[PDB]
Design an enzyme around this catalytic site. Structure first.
Site: not given
Ligand SMILES: CSC[C@H]1CN(Cc2c[nH]c3c(N)ncnc23)C[C@@H]1O
Ligand SMILES: CSC[C@H]1CN(Cc2c[nH]c3c(N)ncnc23)C[C@@H]1O
Lengths: 230, 230
Positions: B13, B154, B198
């Site tokens: 990142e 998640v 995602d």
């Protein structure tokens, strides 16, 4: 000269600490915490409650180290028991801690593991050995074992079983791993001391409400006996 | 003169951030993080990746503020989409953040709530308005909404549904809430910027691996366009 940081999570966990030391404290607010700074037996003691959970306790521990320059951190408070031989009021010190709610298993990482870190975080063997020495001299039981920390109050048999099977944890709380983690990162000796308030099962809320004050005081008394030998 | 802290969670990142600014950086290790300090358009920029999750990001944000004295914190990285109109690569800024894995419901506290805190943490309306202005001028979509943060990656429909129904979250990640929390505590303006990698479902691991680098770069480019107007 020596500077010792003393942490609880809740106000109830540090009230007995402040009272038992019995000295005057200066209150210093920083980052939403109130740090109580006093002098006791020729040591500077800095006492605070973090507020509950991992973010709160990470922040407060970091402030203690970076802003107040403490040379050791001793945590005192209450915890849920995951094992039969740890009963209400009993003391333990954490040999290792784990963040039990960490889950990157979607990438086949073991539960509790984050890249560039480790599942288990160690505490000061020297401080744990001191606790053990004092406990033996006072004829008090003291267990040593793994403490699991996460951002949920655990109150179910299913979650207990997971903590025992996955991490071999003896107790559960919401701050220890984050405190010990920060300390490790800055090379600061850390001891996490807990007194059992409940059994982390369906009855845990009720047991916690009943025993918080007594268990907090038990932990606080013992922490003071440690500071007395430091 | 002006000091701006710039954070990602993963090295991936911040790699594009360092490259896009295109200046020399001095590397300064502290608390297990490496802070890249440079001067860009007459501002001092301090860039770091925290490492993954809430404890890591709390620690790094606290160090930025207390040790480096940054006056604003801008977070840049990737996130999982919880809503149909946020597709891979799309940008959003967090209007509010929540720690979605916090559970003290045993004491009838609402999910996400900790005593002496709040469910939702606000970011800088001024920085969010700047992002929106820039996005409109560049003819880029930018959504504003709630971002949910927790210590799990998640990857299930059941967890998505919970985040949407409980918190009305638009995206999920593992650091934003902790970054914004620390900033709030110290009165430091904060902006949390994310690009979708995602859909936080059963396919999320695979989508994340595919899109991490591109989505990181999308976020990094936009963050730079913000710093260019600060
Ligand atoms: C009001 S929240 C609970 C506070 C007490 N601390 C320790 C603790 C005792 N029993 C626990 C249990 N069953 N599950 C997790 N933690 C604990 C954690 C938090 O500060
Ligand atoms: C290797 S762990 C994932 C890293 C990427 N960050 C954001 C993120 C993208 N998709 C996510 C999802 N489905 N669930 C939670 N978080 C995210 C969080 C962490 O640094």
């Amino acid at each position: 000269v020596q500077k010792i940081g003393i942490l609880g999570a809740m106000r109830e966990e540090i009230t007995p600490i402040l009272e038992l030391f019995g000295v005057d404290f200066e209150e210093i607010p920083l980052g939403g915490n109130v740090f109580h700074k006093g002098v006791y037996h020729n040591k500077e003691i800095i006492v605070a409650y973090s507020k509950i959970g991992k973010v709160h306790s990470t922040l407060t521990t970091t402030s203690m180290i970076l802003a107040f320059g403490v040379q050791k951190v001793l945590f005192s408070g209450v915890a849920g028991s995951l094992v039969k031989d740890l009963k209400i009021n009993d003391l333990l010190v954490a040999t290792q801690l784990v963040q039990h709610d960490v889950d990157l298993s979607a990438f086949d990482h073991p539960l509790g593991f984050i890249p560039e870190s480790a599942i288990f975080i160690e505490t000061s063997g020297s401080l744990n050995a001191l606790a053990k020495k004092i406990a033996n001299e006072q004829h008090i039981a003291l267990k040593e074992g793994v403490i699991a920390s996460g951002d949920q109050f655990v109150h179910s048999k299913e979650r207990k079983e997971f903590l025992v099977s996955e991490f071999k944890a003896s107790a559960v709380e919401m701050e220890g791993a984050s405190v010990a983690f920060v300390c490790q990162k800055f090379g600061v000796p850390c001891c996490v001391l807990r007194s059992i308030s409940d059994n982390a099962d369906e009855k845990a809320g009720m047991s916690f409400d009943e025993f918080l004050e007594k268990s907090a005081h038990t932990s606080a008394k013992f922490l003071k006996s440690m500071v007395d030998e430091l």
